[PDB]
Amino acid sequence: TLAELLGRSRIAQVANNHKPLTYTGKKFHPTHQIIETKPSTLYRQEWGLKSAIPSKIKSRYLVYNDLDTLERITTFEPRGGTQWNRLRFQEMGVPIVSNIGRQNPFFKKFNTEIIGTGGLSYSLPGKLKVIQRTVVPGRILNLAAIGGFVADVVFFQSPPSSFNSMGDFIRMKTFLFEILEASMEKNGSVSMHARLLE
């Protein structure tokens, strides 16, 4: 049926969300679903949205909130790229305690609160990749953004010269960190610890 067809439509497979496309608010979990397009459609300038995406866009990944709007345009930001952060979590290979997983590994009528890893992890907590993890390089904020995830830098002794070496480019400089671990506060926020090798 017309509806049956729409009830399975990829357009509807994507849920609605009017969360701002700027969200200046501190961000922990993603706001919208990125729409992936095969390079073919990109040259064909086809993205499956109500209106074709402008050739100015050269990405294959975009995020949309309004198929189309009064302004006679589709409200989309071609900067949908979470595909990188989450993958880097896999590049980082570290599991989350996830409080206590009674019965079900994530445990929990509706699991709105304590949703779980939040699709940030679907691997057995313990594994041997741990072999001291894989000292993943991170960008020290002062805290160190490792694979798009800030982790508080820890060290045997405070090395001021290391910070002085990068001067004000501490974030610009990237140092390998043996991630101690990460955790998902019920607000879906990951808190982790770094190992400044200095």
Next chain:
Amino acid sequence: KLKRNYNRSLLNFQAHKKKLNELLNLYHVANEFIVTESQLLKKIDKVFNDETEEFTDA
């Protein structure tokens, strides 16, 4: 006609019972005091004599 009468009856009924409930919800218990010369002395003399409530907060 019968259902109409019931509709009018239950309405009047609901209002009066609430009236009664609220009347024995406070008039039954409202300080059980202010209304007499003696009591006023008690409350007023049990106000600034020990506690005082102002904003300013915490």
Next chain:
Amino acid sequence: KIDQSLSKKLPKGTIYDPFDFSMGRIHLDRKYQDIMKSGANPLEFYARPRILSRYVTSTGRIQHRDITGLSAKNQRRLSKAIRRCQAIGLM
């Protein structure tokens, strides 16, 4: 050492991006930068001159619904409470 207006300091909690680490981003943010607002009869605070002291240009002046942005009813009752508080000794 460096000036503030040139260095985002995303908290660790968030998700930093390659662009996110840019000046463009800083400018971007700037561009896109309340129990009364919650829904409590703002007039009931006809006295408590403390609560009303808030939505006030600090010059005995209430604010146009461009700042306060409280509900028409909430703002008008808040304004009435302020005016009533002027009558009620305190403020």
Next chain:
Amino acid sequence: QRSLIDRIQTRLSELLSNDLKCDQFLKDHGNIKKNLLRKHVMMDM
């Protein structure tokens, strides 16, 4: 009073399903004959 509506309505209404059981009923007492249902049904109570 509300009780009346119960049984009163309940059987005339119940008669919805009984164009056969009413047969038992129609007799005891004795279209607008459907209206004849409420007729004597009402009297019972």
Next chain:
Amino acid sequence: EPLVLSKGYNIEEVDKFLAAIESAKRERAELSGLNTEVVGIEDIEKLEDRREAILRILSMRNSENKNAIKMAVELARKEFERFPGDTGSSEVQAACMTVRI
């Protein structure tokens, strides 16, 4: 008249409803494992006033003319009605407009 009140509060119902409390208070204690002491009179003095205030706080002499009218329209409707309830009869409507007039 003296002792009149608002929202259907006839003084009697008050006397009888207020009274309910008397029965309840004492009977609440008859059972359980707590004995009877000061409740011999439950401050006749205190209960006497409690009701009293209720009366001042529900006395038309201390309410609003609107409320006295709310009582009146009724009185009239009930003196001019065609049957218990009718409130649309021309005389009922007339009588009602009369009180206000």
Next chain:
Amino acid sequence: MLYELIGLVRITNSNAPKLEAKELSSTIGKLIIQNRGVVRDIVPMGIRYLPKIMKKDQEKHFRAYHFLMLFDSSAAVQSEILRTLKKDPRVIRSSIVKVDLDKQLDRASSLHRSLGKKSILELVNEDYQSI
């Protein structure tokens, strides 16, 4: 009906700050009572320097002892209370505002109503706990 009097009384006793305030609180009260009407809740608001120097009887009171009395009386008694107040040299800046109880049989003092509360019977079980 239920009225309220957020009046600001003056003070002169370097010592007792709530001298006059309490003495007036008695006055008003004595009269709210001898006249068919129920006093309800009194909520001493203590002292708060007045935002401006409120000159009363050429005394330029820079501060006053705010206080509140929730009362109930006929218009007249309520009106009359106004007269008493302004005309009481002690009080400095009075005020009686109404508290219609058409919906809630018992209304609390404005303050608690902004504290989240709403009724004395409520505000009483609010403390009832104990026994």
Next chain:
Amino acid sequence: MKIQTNAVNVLQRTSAYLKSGLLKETPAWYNVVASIPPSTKFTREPRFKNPSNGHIIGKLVDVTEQPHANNKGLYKTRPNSSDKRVGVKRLYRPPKLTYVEDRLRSLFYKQHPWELSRPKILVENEIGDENYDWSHMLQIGRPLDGESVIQRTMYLIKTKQYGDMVEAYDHARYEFYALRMQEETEQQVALEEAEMFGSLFGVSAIEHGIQKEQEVLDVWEKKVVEETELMAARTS
């Protein structure tokens, strides 16, 4: 614009010219638009039932069709305001295509925001050849997504393998987790194994994460070279 006439009336128009002399040879197309006459009615035809929620559009609850005093303990007998407010525009008004599955979609994506972050094939391929046995939360062609979980809960509520919608979805929610859990291990295995079997990698997720980031730093560093300094002269 306004329902025009000189648009779907060309044959009528040409015919006249063709019968008089303004034209000598008929416009070739003449026959085609005769064989296939143009739909001329432009009526705002009415609707009677919602194509989706199966609701009906066109009924009134005559009071007799009711007898239970409303929850508001009250036997209503006289028709109510809205119940007499001629609602004809409603029939023409297109109804909303409400779907409980859409709520489940949002619910799952809210509980699993990373699923939204996960690339989805919104581009629909020949939807015709898509008959999918959904007793399993996996299908050939269709990839893994929260949408699969939704189409899955349907069996558990249609076939009724489980009970209500909430319980049904969860049964598949754990079904999904497993597929995702196994995939996570599979993902690492490729590398670990390939990593321990003659494999060289030009750039990894950490590498794009650093190169692009360091690239950005090029701009910021140069930028503050003007901003901070310009202020010294702007204030000295």
Next chain:
Amino acid sequence: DSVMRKRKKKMKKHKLRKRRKREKAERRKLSQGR
């Protein structure tokens, strides 16, 4: 036309001046015992 309406203004003002002159004749010997 506003200009046409303004002309009324000039005419009413002119008549007002005449009225002032007529006012002298009014309340005089003509409107009393005659």
Next chain:
RNA sequence: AUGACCCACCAAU
């Protein structure tokens, strides 16, 4: 073509 005439300027938000 009709067709001898045209007359006013004062200084700021």
Next chain:
RNA sequence: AUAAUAGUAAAGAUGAAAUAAUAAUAAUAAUUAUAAGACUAAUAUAUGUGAAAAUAUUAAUUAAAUAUUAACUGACAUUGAGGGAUUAAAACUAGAGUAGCGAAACGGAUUCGAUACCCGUGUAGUUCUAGUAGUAAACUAUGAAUACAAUUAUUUAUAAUAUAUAUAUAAAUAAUAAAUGAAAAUGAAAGUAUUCCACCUGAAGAGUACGUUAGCAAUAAUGAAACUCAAAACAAUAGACG
């Protein structure tokens, strides 16, 4: 305005200047302090509320005004000649008041002249109280009522939902479709229709004269004719002009 105070020579106003009871009587400015009046910032959109006048400093009393159900009434209405009621600003008659404002007045400017614009005093009045009067571009230049007609966005009222959501209703406001229209444009009316009342029939003369009623009065309503023209009016367009 008025003393108190200390302070010194200008003040103040304007395009620029003059003056006045400005200031060597010590001013203005300052800071205190008395008194007298009018008014009511923000909020504040006149959103709204009122029949229209009108109307946002606070409270008190009184009164009207909401939606939705429910009970009733049982066409009881649509609105209306005449009548009645209310009716801005000015004006008026009494009584109090009178700070500021400001007709009149008088003075100083400017100007060719300036009984103006500008500036200084500043009286009737603007305030209240009781009146009187009954007119305004009293204009949305749009009489009231009912049934109906295509969309969108915002207010927003309000029910509902499994409040915080996305929905159903109304209400208003803003863009329009159609339709109407001399066009400008009107847009749920200036559309489609029905009902009732008011009013118009070229321009001048004229809302004049006269008569009559009403008013303390100014005036208000009512409201002709002769004489004289082929004129007179409105929306759209070019163009010249500022």
